[PDB]
Structures are given as structure tokens and as C-alpha cells.
Amino acid sequence: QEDVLAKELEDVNKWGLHVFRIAELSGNRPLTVIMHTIFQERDLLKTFKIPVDTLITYLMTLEDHYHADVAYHNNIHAADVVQSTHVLLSTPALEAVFTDLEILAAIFASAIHDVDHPGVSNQFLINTNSELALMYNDSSVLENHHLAVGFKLLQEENCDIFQNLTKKQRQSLRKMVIDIVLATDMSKHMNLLADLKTMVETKKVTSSGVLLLDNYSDRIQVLQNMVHCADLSNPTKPLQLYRQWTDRIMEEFFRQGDRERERGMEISPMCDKHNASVEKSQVGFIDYIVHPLWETWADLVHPDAQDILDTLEDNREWYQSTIPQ
Ligand SMILES: COc1ccc2ccc(=O)oc2c1CC=C(C)C
Numbered sequence: 001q002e003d004v005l006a007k008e009l010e011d012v013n014k015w016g017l018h019v020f021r022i023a024e025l026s027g028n029r030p031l032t033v034i035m036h037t038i039f040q041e042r043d044l045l046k047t048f049k050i051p052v053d054t055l056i057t058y059l060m061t062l063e064d065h066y067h068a069d070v071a072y073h074n075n076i077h078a079a080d081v082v083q084s085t086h087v088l089l090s091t092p093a094l095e096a097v098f099t100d101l102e103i104l105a106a107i108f109a110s111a112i113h114d115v116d117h118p119g120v121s122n123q124f125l126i127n128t129n130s131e132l133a134l135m136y137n138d139s140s141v142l143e144n145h146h147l148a149v150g151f152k153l154l155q156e157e158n159c160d161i162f163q164n165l166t167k168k169q170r171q172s173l174r175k176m177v178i179d180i181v182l183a184t185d186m187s188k189h190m191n192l193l194a195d196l197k198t199m200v201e202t203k204k205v206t207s208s209g210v211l212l213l214d215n216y217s218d219r220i221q222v223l224q225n226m227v228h229c230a231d232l233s234n235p236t237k238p239l240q241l242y243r244q245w246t247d248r249i250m251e252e253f254f255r256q257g258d259r260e261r262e263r264g265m266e267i268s269p270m271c272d273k274h275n276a277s278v279e280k281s282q283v284g285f286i287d288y289i290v291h292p293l294w295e296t297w298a299d300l301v302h303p304d305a306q307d308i309l310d311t312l313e314d315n316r317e318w319y320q321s322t323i324p325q
């Protein structure tokens with residue numbers, strides 16, 4: 001069924017790719033095939049002299065380290081964030097703003113951003129005194145781990161996709177990737193958003209009508225927010241995709257809750273299956289986190305993101321209308 005897969009992959013540049021269908025068609029290799037497709041589209045193998053076999057080996061290794069038993073934070077979510085970042089990077093307001101190295105950083109960061117996620121929160125890991133919380137001194141535990149695993153896997157057999165980048169490129173790439181993935185810790189959300197707003201308030205556009213970004217701080221800020229948006233893009237996708245995501249995160253939160261209950265721990269917010277309001281929580285999530293983020297983003301790239309914002313709003317109303325009264 002190589003052809004049905006290939007047809008589905010033609011939508012790689014569109015918001016709302018059917019990533020679950022691609023996961024099925026590809027034999028649960030959504031991250032591998034989507035990354036590969038994206039790297040060919042953007043000509044990254046040629047530009048950075050990445051042997052195609054090294055790329056595929058790395059991708060399969062990377063995908064293998066997402067957990068098949070985790071319902072949300074798995075290779076499908078990783079594939080989704082990659083493809084979403086890929087669309088955001090193609091927004092007219094950002095045309096020719098970012099270098100190829102910057103583009104590679106954003107996409108690689110998206111690919112690795114949740115790798116080896118155990119399906120529980122930083123707080124659970126801190127409360128149980130896990131080795132991970134210990135090694136990372138309780139700070140952005142999962143996120144530091146995602147990075148270290150992602151880079152560490154480059155050392156497996158025929159996995160070094162950066163073998164042909166100069167040392168200066170590698171150092172620049174590594175810095176950008178690190179800055180991006182640490183920004184995906186939800187505890188950094190408010191500060192990211194605050195900085196995004198500031199940038200929007202003093203927004204400058206170029207002669208050619210694209211965003212002006214003068215310095216590393218402004219550049220990396222946008223890339224961080226871009227990937228953060230991709231990470232928080234579920235409520236902005238067609239409703240049939242959104243609802244599957246919602247099912248999956250709830251399943252994952254509810255397993256954590258069960259685990260906290262059987263261990264005698266305080267149950268985390270939204271993790272109690274006996275005490276849950278899925279719909280109301282989605283509305284809350286939209287009102288207080290997702291819509292504030294996407295509206296600010298939409299202002300930065302005005303009017304590129306208007307349809308994404310409209311769908312966000314249609315979807316909020318759907319969940320509002322589905323709250324048990
Ligand atoms: C941190 O919170 C997240 C993270 C990722 C997703 C993804 C899809 C989604 O449907 O909601 C998400 C939420 C909010 C969930 C609830 C319980 C309000």
C-alpha cells in the first residue's frame with residue numbers, strides 16, 4: 001500500500017494532515033516517513049550532506065525510543081509536532097527569515113522534543129525521587145532528558161546525521177536545539193508568552209513584508225514560540241483530529257492519576273478519572289493557554305494564521321456545547 005501512503009504524504013505542507021492515518025499506513029512509522037518527506041522537500045540532505053541511510057537509521061532509532069504504550073507522548077505526537085512546525089516555518093510572514101541551519105534546528109528539536117517520555121509529569125518524577133529528577137536537580141527534568149536522549153542516539157551505529165556539519169555549525173545547531181526544547185516545559189509558558197507579546201508590540205517588518213529579526217535573542221524567541229505553538233496545536237486542528245488528541249491525553253493523565261492513587265500520592269489536576277470534566281477542561285485550556293498563545297502568534301504573522309485561529313474558536317464552542325449541564 002506504498003501508494004496510498006504516498007498520496008497521504010502529499011498533504012505534508014497542510015495544516016490538518018491526517019497523522020493517525022499516516023501512522024497506520026506506514027506501519028507505525030509516522031515520525032520516520034514524515035521527517036524523511038520533510039527533509040527531501042526542504043533539500044536538507046543535500047544542503048547538509050546527510051547520507052540518506054544515516055538519516056533513515058537515525059529516524060528509526062529516534063522513533064523506536066518513543067514509547068508505544070504511552071497514549072499521548074509517543075511517536076505520533078512527535079510526528080505531529082514536526083509537521084506542524086514545518087507548516088509554521090512556511091508561513092508567508094517568515095519567508096526567507098531563517099537560515100537553513102535554523103530551519104534544521106527547529107525541525108530536529110520538534111522531532112526529539114518528547115523522546116523517551118515515560119507518560120508522567122515532571123512533578124511525579126520529582127515526588128518519587130526518580131534517578132531522572134536526581135540527575136537533573138528537579139529542573140525541567142523530562143525536557144533535559146528528551147534533549148540528552150535525542151543527542152545521545154546520534155552515537156548509535158550509522159546514526160550521526162550531523163557528521164558533515166562544520167564544528168561551528170554543530171555548535172550553533174546544538175545551542176538552538178537546546179534552547180528550543182527547554183522552552184517546551186509548560187512552566188516556561190507565561191514568560192514565553194510575555195516575551196512574544198512584547199515582540200508583537202514592537203513588531204518590525206522588512207521591505208519585502210516579512211518579520212525583521214535583528215539578533216539571536218529575537219530569532220530564538222520566535223523559534224521557541226513556534227515550536228511551543230506546534231506543541232500546543234491540537235485544539236487548532238480539524239475537530240476529528242482534535243478529539244483523538246483529547247482522548248489520548250486524557251487516557252495518559254488518567255493512568256498517571258491511577259498511579260498516584262495506588263501509591264497514596266495527591267492526585268494531579270485533571271488526572272482523576274472519578275472526578276473529571278473533560279469538556280470543561282478543554283474549554284479552560286483553550287481560554288487560558290491555547291487561545292492567548294495562538295492569538296499573539298496570529299498577530300505576529302498577521303494575517304497568515306487567521307484560519308487556524310477560526311478553527312480554534314469553532315472547536316472551543318464544540319466542547320462548550322458538550323459540557324454536561
Ligand atoms: C498540558 O496540558 C495539555 C497538553 C497537551 C494537550 C494536547 C491535547 C489536548 O487535548 O489537551 C492537552 C492539554 C490539556 C489537557 C487537559 C486535561 C486540560
Ligand SMILES: [Zn+2]
Pocket residue numbers: 113114184185
Ligand atoms: Zn514535552
Ligand SMILES: [Zn+2]
Pocket residue numbers: 077081113114231
Ligand atoms: Zn510535546
